[PDB]
Structures are given as structure tokens and as C-alpha cells.
């Protein structure tokens, strides 16, 4: 009894297609073409009394303000622009007009009440504008809110207007604590500037030269846009991947046009506009066509604005379980004149790489409550901005349900197993090796989700594969083999391929990995050659 299982069993009714015996209505047809209508716009009390007269300075707040006023490179310096008691901003948190959150999501982000008012009294450390070059001086300041009616002297730090109260960093109400919390971000920004400023200067110079070459306006905005574009022409080897020790993968759901999600990722306000590495996912390009022995992974690396963490998005074009047609001429004849094309299923993961921090994540409790609220799987040490950016991107795309972690993938795999055990509904045509059906079935989706679980580093992936292998179908065995390759279990992959009976499945499984001889994998038992036995088992260990 889960939404995923319900969708798998009784899928929604799509464009009906009648026939002489039945009517197929659950086909996952591609989204009709997009359009842009200029007529449609892009967009879609107690606080007053406190500001007027009720506001009163308590002892602790007065002490903190006095310490900040006394103050006891711009990247490292932490300013504090204290306002006047009459000039304090009093009111609730107002989401920007471009906020697609639901009412429940807004309530959760406001902690059970959107009417709550937070008093903002001074600014704080500044961060560069999103469009600006990433290694630029801080421009947009941070805010320091304080709840006028709170039992404990809590002070909230808001890095920007795009993060709601649920992500505001709480502080112990001490000037030293606030200074240390801000110094964490200041030092992180200074390190980022010291590390990646020369690379961005080189990119800026190359962008200027390219604009000079291809006659184009050379304004500052034009140069910034061309740097963001040249992010496309970034080499994988010279990429800031594996930078910070901490890593964690997340699943962003299966899609059909990954560029549509990557556009949301690019336009996320919490990420810079000049990524270190970008790759357009043209599924129709000769090198990006998904296949069982598919091309691989399209990687795009973005850096967060405030906490200099990295979102390494990976569109896995390789993940597939559907065998190529054995009669391509007949398949083309079948699907030539068809005006209905089944929607693809390509997975997109994201590695979050963040520095070892003790205050940027908020002490752990903030992300613990965030996880308890949103059913996510964020690590307690994740920087707040990275988690907020991921949540915002998923909400904007419309795949919050598909935004799953290791436990979510485990539950999805369990639901897929339940669906596999239950009888499979019929489809347009059964599909044969000569003319396969481009419609993902229960077994194929189960194999793909096993691969996804393996991709999301799981200590129990090997055990799960070993338990699934005895009872499973050929697509599931293919998925298990690919999962074993992803994990790095050479012995498990060799066992799977040896157990696999002869067929095109085993052929493609052998073709997957880089091997010495196909016999080393195919021959479960050493087969004498020239009156000599070869033991290739040690190779795969």
C-alpha cells in the first residue's frame, strides 16, 4: 500500500489507443511539445504592533548588540551593520514570488506556522551574486533574525532570502558563537577563492578571447554568460571533483529529457551561474544513445553559493536492461510512422561533496529535524544551503516523491519486488528479441532500481544482489551484474556471468567490463585448452 506500488499496478490513463480486441490506455507517452506563451506571466498585526511600540530590548539581546557594535581582507572580515530599534524589520518570512512550494511545504518550512514573525535587526557577512563570477567579493549580506517572544535566547542566521526559517542556522545566543559560525563560512569562501580563482581567471580570459574571435558584444554580462557557456567546454580530468572528503549520493528520479531537469539545476538561485563542468545530455547524439553497454555518465558539477559545496549531477545514460533488437529493419518499420512514442527512463543522481564542518551544517539537529519533516536522507553534516538547493530544485521540477535516498531506494526495490510477484498487466505488444517493446516492464524496472541502489553506495548491496540472484528474471540478473560492476565486486560479477546461461544477455554482460578473454568470464568451470587448464578466477577478486 504505497503510491509507487499503486502506480506500478494500476498506472494512470494516458492517451487511449484502441485496437480490434482491446484499448491500451496506460502507455507512458512522451510529454507533448513545450510552448512559450507571452500572455502567461512568469510568476505563475502582531508584527506591526511590535514594530510600533511593543518591541523591547531584553538584557541578552542588548548585550549581544553592544558586543557587535564594539566589534570584539573582505573575504575574512565579518561586518555587522546594526540597525535602529525603530528600523528593525518586523514580519513573517515571505517566500519569493517564484516559490512553487505547496501549502503543507510552506508550513513545514515555517515550522508549523507561516504567521510567525521574526525580527531582523542587523546584516552580516556578504556572499557573491549568483550570476557574478564565483570567486567574487561578497555582495548580498546575510540577515540575523531573532524571535521577540522566545523562551531561549536563540538567534537565527539567514544566508539569503531563498532559505526559509527551517534552514536558518540557530545559534546559542552568544556573540562569540555567532562570530565563529560566520567565520566558518568566511574561511570556506576564502579557501575557495584561494583555490579556484586562477582557474576562473583563465576561463574569463578564454571567454574574452572567444568573444573577440566570434564577433559578439564584450560587456561584463556578455562575458559572464559566455563563461557560463564555456563551462560546457570543461575537461573531466581538470575538474574539482573529489575535492572534499565527505560524499553522499542522492536519487533525483527517472526522466525522459534530462536537460529539462538540468535547466532547473542551473537556474537554482542557491547555485552559481558558472559551473565548473557541464555536459548537455543529447540522448540522440551518436555518443549518448542509451544501451545495455551504454556510453556512460554525463556529469555536471555545480558549486553552491554560500557553503562552497559541490553538487556533482550524474545522468547515467548507460543504465539499461532492454536488449537491442535482433531485427532492426522490422523494428524501424514498426516504429516509423507511429505518432506515439513511449517515454524513456534515464536516472539522474547527485553526489554532494562538502567540507568537514562543525557549524555550517547547523550542529546536526537542524538537518535531523529537516529529515524528520521531509522524509529525506540528508547526512547530519551536510551544509544547509546544499540541502535547501536540492529540495528547491526537486520541488521546482516536480519530483519530490522521486527524490529518494538509500532507504527510499530500498523501499522502491521492495515495492518493485511486490509488483514482480503480482501478475503483470498487458501492454501494446509483448515484444520479442526480433521486435522488442520500448516499454519498461516490471522486471526491467526492478533491474534498473537494483542498479540505482548499487550506485547509491550501500553496504548491503552485495548481500542484496546475492539474495536476489537465486530467484529473479534475466533482466534482473543483468541489472544485478551492472550493480556488481558499479559496486566494484569483481568476484560477484564473475559469479553472476558464469551462472547466467548462454544467450545475448550473457554476451552483453561479458561485453560490459574490460576483460582479457571472454572465456575467463563465460567458463564457470575451467575448460581445457591445448591440454591446459586456465584459472582466471584470481583476476576477478
Amino acid at each position: 500500500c504505497s503510491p509507487f506500488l499503486s502506480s506500478l499496478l494500476s498506472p494512470v490513463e494516458t492517451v487511449p489507443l484502441h485496437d480490434v480486441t482491446r484499448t491500451y490506455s496506460t502507455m507512458d507517452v512522451v510529454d507533448p511539445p513545450a510552448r512559450y506563451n507571452p500572455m502567461v506571466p512568469n510568476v505563475e498585526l502582531w508584527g506591526v504592533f511590535e514594530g510600533s511600540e511593543d518591541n523591547k530590548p531584553p538584557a541578552w539581546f542588548y548585550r549581544l548588540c553592544k558586543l557587535f557594535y564594539r566589534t570584539n581582507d573582505p573575504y575574512v572580515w565579518i561586518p555587522f551593520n546594526l540597525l535602529d530599534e525603530a528600523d528593525y524589520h518586523v514580519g513573517p518570512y515571505r517566500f519569493p514570488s517564484t516559490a512553487t512550494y505547496t501549502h503543507e511545504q510552506r508550513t513545514l518550512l515555517c515550522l508549523g506556522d507561516t504567521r510567525r514573525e521574526y525580527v531582523h535587526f542587523c546584516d552580516s557577512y556578504a556572499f557573491p551574486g549568483r550570476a557574478q563570477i564565483p570567486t567574487s567579493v561578497g555582495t548580498c549580506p546575510s540577515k540575523l533574525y531573532v524571535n521577540p517572544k522566545q523562551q531561549q535566547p536563540v538567534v537565527y542566521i539567514q544566508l539569503s532570502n531563498d532559505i526559509p526559517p527551517a534552514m536558518w542556522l540557530p545559534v546559542k545566543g552568544t556573540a562569540a558563537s555567532v562570530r565563529r559560525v560566520l567565520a566558518e563560512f568566511a574561511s570556506m569562501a576564502a579557501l575557495h577563492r584561494d583555490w579556484h580563482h586562477d582557474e576562473f581567471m583563465e576561463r574569463h580570459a578564454t571567454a574574452v578571447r572567444m568573444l573577440e574571435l566570434q564577433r559578439l558584444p564584450a560587456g561584463e554580462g556578455d562575458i559572464l554568460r559566455y563563461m557560463a557557456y564555456d563551462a560546457r567546454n570543461a575537461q573531466f580530468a581538470f575538474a574539482p571533483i573529489r575535492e572534499f572528503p565527505n560524499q553522499q549520493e542522492f536519487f533525483l528520479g527517472e526522466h525522459d529529457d534530462p536537460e529539462k531537469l538540468m535547466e532547473h539545476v542551473d537556474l537554482c538561485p542557491l547555485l552559481f551561474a558558472i559551473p565548473h563542468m557541464r555536459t548537455v545530455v543529447d540522448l540522440h547524439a551518436e555518443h549518448m544513445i542509451p544501451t545495455i553497454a551504454g556510453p556512460g555518465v554525463a556529469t555536471s558539477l555545480y558549486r553552491c553559493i554560500y557553503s562552497k559545496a559541490l553538487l556533482f549531477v550524474q545522468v547515467h545514460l548507460s543504465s539499461e536492461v532492454k536488449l537491442p533488437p535482433q531485427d532492426p529493419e522490422a523494428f524501424k518499420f514498426m516504429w516509423k510512422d507511429s505518432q506515439v512514442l513511449p517515454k524513456m527512463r534515464i536516472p539522474v543522481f547527485v553526489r554532494v561533496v562538502w567540507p568537514t564542518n562543525e557549524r555550517m551544517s547547523g550542529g546536526g539537529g537542524l538537518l535531523r529535524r529537516f529529515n524528520r519533516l521531509f522524509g529525506t536522507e540528508f547526512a547530519s553534516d551536510i551544509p544547509v544551503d546544499a540541502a535547501m538547493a536540492l529540495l528547491y530544485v526537486m520541488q521546482w521540477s516536480g519530483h519530490i516523491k522521486d527524490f529518494l535516498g538509500v532507504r527510499g531506494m530500498r523501499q522502491r526495490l521492495a515495492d518493485l519486488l511486490l509488483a514482480s510477484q503480482q501478475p503483470e498487466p498487458t501492454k501494446l505488444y509483448p515484444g520479442t528479441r526480433e521486435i522488442p517493446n520500448p516499454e519498461y516492464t516490471v522486471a526491467e524496472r526492478l533491474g534498473m532500481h537494483v542498479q540505482y541502489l548499487a550506485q547509491l553506495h550501500d553496504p548491503d548491496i552485495s548481500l542484496t544482489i546475492q539474495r536476489l540472484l537465486p530467484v529473479a528474471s534475466a533482466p534482473v540478473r543483468m541489472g544485478c551484474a551492472k550493480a556488481a560492476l558499479i559496486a566494484g565486486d569483481r568476484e560477484l560479477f564473475r559469479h553472476i556471468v558464469s551462472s547466467e546461461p548462454p544467450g545475448r544477455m550473457q554476451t552483453y554482460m561479458t561485453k560490459l567490463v574490460r576483460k582479457r578473454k571472454t572465456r575467463d568470464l563465460v567458463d564457470a568451470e575451467p575448460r581445457l585448452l591445448e591440454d591446459q587448464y586456465e584459472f582466471a578466477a584470481p583476476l576477478w577478486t
Binding site: 480486441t21 482491446r22 532492454k322 536488449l323 533488437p325 535482433q326 530500498r410 523501499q411 526495490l413 521492495a414 519486488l417 511486490l418 510477484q421 501478475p423 503483470e424 498487458t426 501492454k427 505488444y429 509483448p430 515484444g431 520479442t432 528479441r433 522488442p436 517493446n437 516492464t441 522486471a443 542484496t464 539474495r467 536476489l468 530467484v471 528474471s473 534475466a474 533482466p475 547466467e500 546461461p501 548462454p502 544467450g503 545475448r504 544477455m505 550473457q506
Partner: protein
Amino acid sequence: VLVLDNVDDPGLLGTVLRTAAGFHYDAVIATNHCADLYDHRVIRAARGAHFQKAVPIYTLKEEDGDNVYGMLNHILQRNDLSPVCFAARDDNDATDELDDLVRQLR
């Protein structure tokens, strides 16, 4: 319609093919790890089953891209057919998918 599930015995498979040809079955389908339809023992058992047009023989393998259960369901739905199963031996009660699901949920 006839479906042969995990025969694995060339002589038994050939005799079954001969019986199907004699009874003029509409179509016979070898579904699960059945003995190779083209084998010396199978041909010895079946004199002319492979060369008879009346009894079309199909070999569906999930390891070559064929959704055999999908094909069976499609045939059943199209022809308004009824399924009947026959097992040479009995069938006990034992499963581990429930344990796997429990572990995944935990």
C-alpha cells in the same frame, strides 16, 4: 495452445512434440530452460515434428529479450483463452521473497 516449461529431457521433449503434431495443436511454445529444440536426441525422438507446418513451434527465452509471460498474457487476452497447468510432481510451500521484502522494509 501448448506450453512446455522446463522439460530439459530431450526424449520427453521430442515425444511431446510428436504428440502435439499428431493432435494438431494450434501452437507449442517452449518457455523456461527447455531442452534445445534443435538437438540430436530431440530429433531422434521426434521424427518430423520440426518440419511440420501444422504445429508451429516457438522457443521463448527471457535471456534473449523475449518477455515470455507477457506473450502468454497477450495470447490469453487476445484469444479469450483459459489457462490450465500440469506439473509432473507436486508443489510444496516455501518462499524467501517475503523475507527479502521484510529486510528491505526494515
